[PDB]
Amino acid sequence: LSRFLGPRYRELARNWIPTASMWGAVGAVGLVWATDWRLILDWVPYINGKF
């Protein structure tokens, strides 16, 4: 398919993949206190967040 074909489609997606960890890692930090992810609160020694 030549649906989304082109060197233009991955050129704006070339300069956005630095700020497309604002898509995935922001979801990874968007589920730290909304979820209480238990074994990745010891990602840091800093969060003794519940007593």
């Binding site: 233009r8 050129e11 704006l12 300069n15 700020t19």
Partner: protein, 446 residues
């Protein structure tokens, strides 16, 4: 058949000389029976204070009304009887008088120009006749909406500086300028180190230099009664003027950020960028297919009558922005699409856009220098601005080093988190609030 590169080498060069006065004399010779010769002066309304703001424009009116040697209409009879033309203008920075004549009438043409700028009469009966001509010309300027809205943009971007004044001055100064205020204006600002004698066409440089030595050598070429102006810069202020008048059929809006001065090297990639935004008018034949995004949108939806982008430069500062005309229900959409094109160049600017914008700027520089009158004006105003004439081969090597990452860097420096200056003339109820305009300068996702 030569190339474009070989044709830039065979352009004739400009020869500059100087007198003991300090008066500069420049020429470009090219094989023609006609010529244009004139005088360019560092004078303007930014050198006036609040007491004499209409002084330099009043003097330009009296320049062809008779001198000491040729009184009254005897100057007009001499120019007309040889088939020559005589013109003038005045900006905020410059003043020019020039003659288009035949190239064998050059000794008579230089003699008339030296007599205009040195020995003008400024008699009392002609001064009282000239007030009513100027007062009627101010009322005619109020009907031109484009001239009013650019006077509003200077008055709000440079609020408490000399650069906010108008060229013509207010109407109360016009009623009260005496003969004494005009003679002080000439002896202070019409000085030989601030003047340039330029010529283009069928001229020899050696002939113009000897004509300048017998007609201009009695200019005071010192700094007697010392009036060398301590050049104060002028600051930019983000602000707004709104003039609401619902009886007018269309609305005029101008918006700008602070831009670079004359000798700043950022000027060349900033007009590659303005050539990507472009201009539009509804008498164009190319609409909905045009390369510019703002032009193609305004033709498809019928959003405006016209728009244009500008690059106004002064010695240390400038204005960088756009002007458009539309109806009363289209102001919010046109401001939305224009601000979205500025943000799309601060990021995201592509290489094929920059190739088109470089080709536009090369064509606009060559097309301006066509004829003896625009070549002569480019000589006389580049020696007051850069101190030299920049040849066409040097403009091309600066244009050739612009690419897409340079355009992204210079547009982010001048546009992004900056406060604009806004001017509007009615019916402008749908012109957005300044907080909503200022928040349109920073983007959401980048």
């Amino acid at each position: 058949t030569a190339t474009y590169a070989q044709a830039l080498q065979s352009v004739p060069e400009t020869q500059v000389s100087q007198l003991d006065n300090g008066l500069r004399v420049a020429s470009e010779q090219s094989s023609q029976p006609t010529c244009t010769v004139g005088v360019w002066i560092d004078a303007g309304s930014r050198y006036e204070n609040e007491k004499n703001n209409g002084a330099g424009y009043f003097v330009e009116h009296l320049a062809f009304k008779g001198t000491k040697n040729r009184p009254g209409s005897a100057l007009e009879k001499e120019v007309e009887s040889m088939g020559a033309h005589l013109n003038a203008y005045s900006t905020r920075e410059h003043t020019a008088y020039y003659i288009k004549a035949l190239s064998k009438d050059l000794p008579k043409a230089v003699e008339l120009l030296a007599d205009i700028v040195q020995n003008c009469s400024l008699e009392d009966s002609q001064i009282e006749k000239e007030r009513d001509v100027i007062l009627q010309e101010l009322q005619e300027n109020d009907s031109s909406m484009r001239d009013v809205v650019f006077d509003y943009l200077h008055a709000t971007a440079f609020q408490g500086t000399p650069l906010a004044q108008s060229v013509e001055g207010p109407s109360e100064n016009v009623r009260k300028l005496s003969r004494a205020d005009l003679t002080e204006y000439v002896s202070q600002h019409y000085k030989a180190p601030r003047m340039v004698l330029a010529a283009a066409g069928g001229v020899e440089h050696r002939q113009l230099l000897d004509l300048a030595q017998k007609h201009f050598s009695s200019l005071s070429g010192t700094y007697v009664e010392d009036a060398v102006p301590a050049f104060t810069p002028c600051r930019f202020t983000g602000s707004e003027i709104r003039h609401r008048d619902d009886a007018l059929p269309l609305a005029h809006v101008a918006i700008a950020v602070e831009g670079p001065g004359w000798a700043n090297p950022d000027n060349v990639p900033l007009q590659v960028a303005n050539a990507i935004i472009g201009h539009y008018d509804s008498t164009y034949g190319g609409g909905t297919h045009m390369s510019s995004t703002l032009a193609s949108v305004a033709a498809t939806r019928k959003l405006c009558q016209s728009f244009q982008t500008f690059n106004i430069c002064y010695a240390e500062t400038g204005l960088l922005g756009a002007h458009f005309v539309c109806d009363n229900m289209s102001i919010d959409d046109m401001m939305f699409f224009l601000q979205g094109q500025w943000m799309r160049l601060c990021t995201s600017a592509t290489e094929s856009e920059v190739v088109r914008g470089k080709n536009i700027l090369r064509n606009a520089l060559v097309s301006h220098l066509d004829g003896t009158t625009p070549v002569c004006e480019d000589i006389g105003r580049s020696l007051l601005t850069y101190g030299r004439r920049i040849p066409l081969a040097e403009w091309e090597s600066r244009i050739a080093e612009v690419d897409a990452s340079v355009v992204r860097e210079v547009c982010s420096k001048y546009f992004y988190d900056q406060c604009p200056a806004v001017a509007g003339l009615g019916p402008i109820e749908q012109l957005p609030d300044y907080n909503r305009i200022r928040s349109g300068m920073f983007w959401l996702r980048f």
